[PDB]
Every structure is written in C-alpha cells, then in structure tokens.
C-alpha cells in the first residue's frame, strides 16, 4: 500500500482591507507541513522567522534589497491593485436571501412551538436575523445554527425561536442584508 | 473587513500543485496546471477580469524547489495526518421532488489529498457531481466542497464517502429526507 511520508509547502499572500482601501495590510506567509516558519508583515516592514526553521529564509530574503523593496510596495501594486480589479464582482456582489418560516419538525417540550426562520442563497455573508413577538424583539429562546458558507459564493443559516404560542400572536422574523434597502419580514400567525 | 488571499502549495511525493485566489473565504479562481489556464469559480468572473495562468506555473516551480530545501532542512520531518470533519447538507431547505443540491463539506484536514464518493442507496453516483479545489484556512489546514444535484424523495438516501490517510477507515456521512 501507499504509506510514504508526505511533505507539504504552502505560500500565502494575504491582503487585508479596512474601510475599503484606506488601511491595507499585506501578510506573506510560508508554512512547511502545518508549521508557519517565516513571514513578511507589511506593518513590520521586513521578513521575520516564525520558528527556527524559517530563520535562514528571513535572513537571506532580508539581505535582498530588490525583494524587500518589492514587498514593501505590494500593499499598493498588489493589494490595492487587485482590490480595484475585483471590487465590482466581489465587494459589490449582492444576492438577496430567500426567507421562509415554518415550525421545526422537532418540537420537543409539548405545549410549545419551536419556530424556524430559514435564510438561504444570499451573499455577502454579513446579515442580521432577528425574531419579534408583537413588534417587540425576542432576546431569549433564540438559537442559531450559525453562518454557513456553501463554497459557491452563497450562504445559509437557520435561526430558531422556542415559543409558547397564544392564538392571535404574530411572530416576525426580520432579516437585514446588504442586498435590500429595507428589512425583510416573514410572519408566523399563532 | 475584506481579505483577498493568493494561496499556493506543492505536496510531495504526490506531486500535487495548486494556485488559487480567495475572497472572504470564497474561491475566485485557480489555475489548471495541466491545461495551463485560469478556471474562474463563477463563469461571469472571467468576463470582468483575467489572470495570466503562466504566472502560477512559474511560482509553482519555485514552491517545489523550496519544498525540497525545507524537507531536507527539517531532517525529512513528514507531515502529521489530520483527518477531516465531514458534514452533509443541502444548499437550501429540502422539499419533495423539489430540485436541490447535496453538499459534502470536508474541513479541517491535511495533507490536501482526499477521495470522495457519493452513494445513492449504497451505489456510487457520478452524474451531475462537481467539486472545488482545496481551500485555505487560518490554521493552515484545508477545506473542500463536493456537490450532488438531486431530486428529493423518501425513497432515496445518500452517503458522502470520504477517504483520507488520517481516517483509519473510510467515513460515510449519511443523508435522507428526515420527516
């Protein structure tokens, strides 16, 4: 059988953007197997070994002026440049979420009613889902499955609300997302 | 509030090489090292931008040379296998006979090599299935997505069968219309 040892090498250039392109930070990092050995942080200005394994590299790369100069300018020529190029289909990409409300198939404790607010197919991942009972927000009894990234530029999430239904009550699920100018609401008529 | 990552890797002895760009966790594109071309995650991206694939091929050759140097420098310290967390979900609330897609999420694992198979009623399914390349993680492990478009029914049950050197036995995540 195939039992040979594996040896992995990863190289990552991370461009972190704050307030659009106002504040930009480049983090270049080398990782041997699962160990990051050396990195170039634009905030530091030079390579720094992360573990003894990376020491020879930080030393050798820092002695190369053309390399260091290129690395120091990448925040502009690399990061800001690629941000400008992809902004229209990434930062500005927007897909409205599909929202539906129905009681959970679970319903553990009897005289109750676990409600489920399903929000799916949206982008970006930033979103706010709230539950309301007669216009007033529900603080307790709210449970979420968390934000799920589908890997296809779409997200989904389930937010439950344990209730003690009273004929005539209106439980509203409110969703605020960059795709809509006004919040989306779906009501459950108890 | 936004992170763009250019992630690359070379794995010996498999000779696996990968070059991709990531936007807030979602793949923008990767380069097909064999056909030597850019593969946009979503078709329309390619109409808004371009990437010279050959640049990924130049980098990959440097990444391999460095892997060799580092392999020797660590005294041939091999990687520790970390088995994947596997989850199966649909990309939207399932409704009978309502077109949906099964998602097999393979996460937190390394090295980046896995064998994934879909099973419908204990039988391998090939039709319509697709998959992503290996995606990066802050902890330097990897993520991966495998998809299977399907038509829900109480008669069909599915299993995402995952193999990895970190798993002593193949892992099968079952799925069925829970009602």
């Amino acid at each position: 059988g195939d039992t040979r040892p594996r040896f992995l090498w990863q190289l990552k250039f991370e461009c972190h953007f704050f307030n659009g392109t106002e504040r930009v930070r480049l983090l270049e990092r080398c990782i041997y197997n699962q160990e990051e050995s050396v990195r170039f942080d634009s905030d530091v200005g030079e390579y720094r070994a992360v573990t003894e394994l990376g020491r020879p590299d930080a030393e050798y790369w820092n002695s190369q002026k053309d390399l260091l100069e290129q690395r120091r300018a990448a925040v502009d020529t690399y990061c800001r440049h690629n941000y400008g190029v992809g902004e229209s289909f990434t930062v500005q990409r927007r897909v409205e979420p599909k929202v539906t409300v129905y009681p959970s198939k679970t319903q553990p404790l009897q005289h109750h009613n676990l409600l489920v607010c399903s929000v799916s197919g949206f982008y970006p991942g930033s979103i706010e889902v709230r539950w309301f009972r007669n216009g007033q927000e529900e603080k307790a009894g709210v449970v979420s499955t968390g934000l799920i990234q589908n890997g296809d530029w779409t997200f989904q999430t389930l937010v439950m609300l344990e209730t003690v239904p009273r004929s005539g009550e209106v439980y509203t699920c409110q969703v605020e997302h960059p795709s809509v100018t006004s919040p989306l609401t779906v009501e459950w008529r108890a | 509030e936004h992170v763009i990552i250019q992630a690359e890797f070379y794995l010996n002895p498999d000779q696996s090489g990968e070059f991709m760009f990531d936007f807030d966790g979602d793949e923008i594109f990767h380069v097909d090292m064999a056909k030597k071309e850019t593969v946009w995650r979503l078709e329309e991206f390619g109409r808004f931008a371009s990437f010279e694939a050959q640049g990924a091929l130049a980098n990959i050759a440097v990444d391999k040379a460095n892997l060799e140097i580092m392999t020797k420098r660590s005294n041939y310290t091999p990687i520790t296998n970390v088995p994947p967390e596997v989850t199966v979900l649909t990309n939207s609330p399932v409704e009978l006979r309502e077109p949906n897609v099964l998602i097999c999420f393979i996460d937190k694992f390394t090295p980046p090599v896995v064998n994934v198979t879909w099973l419908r009623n204990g039988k391998p399914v090939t039709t319509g299935v697709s998959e992503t390349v290996f995606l990066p993680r802050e902890d330097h492990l990897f993520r991966k997505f495998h998809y299977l478009p399907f038509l829900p029914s109480t008669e069909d049950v599915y299993d995402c069968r995952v193999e990895h050197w970190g798993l002593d036995e193949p892992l099968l995540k079952h799925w069925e219309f829970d009602a």
């Binding site: 690399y78 190029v85 | 460095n66």
Partner: peptide, 13 residues
C-alpha cells in the same frame, strides 16, 4: 482588468 500575482521568493540552496 488583470489580477496580478506576487512572485515566490526562492530559499537559498
């Protein structure tokens, strides 16, 4: 518009 990559730095042999 073109996405531009950063080029790999080679370790000293």
């Amino acid at each position: 518009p073109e996405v531009i990559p950063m080029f790999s730095a080679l370790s000293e042999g």
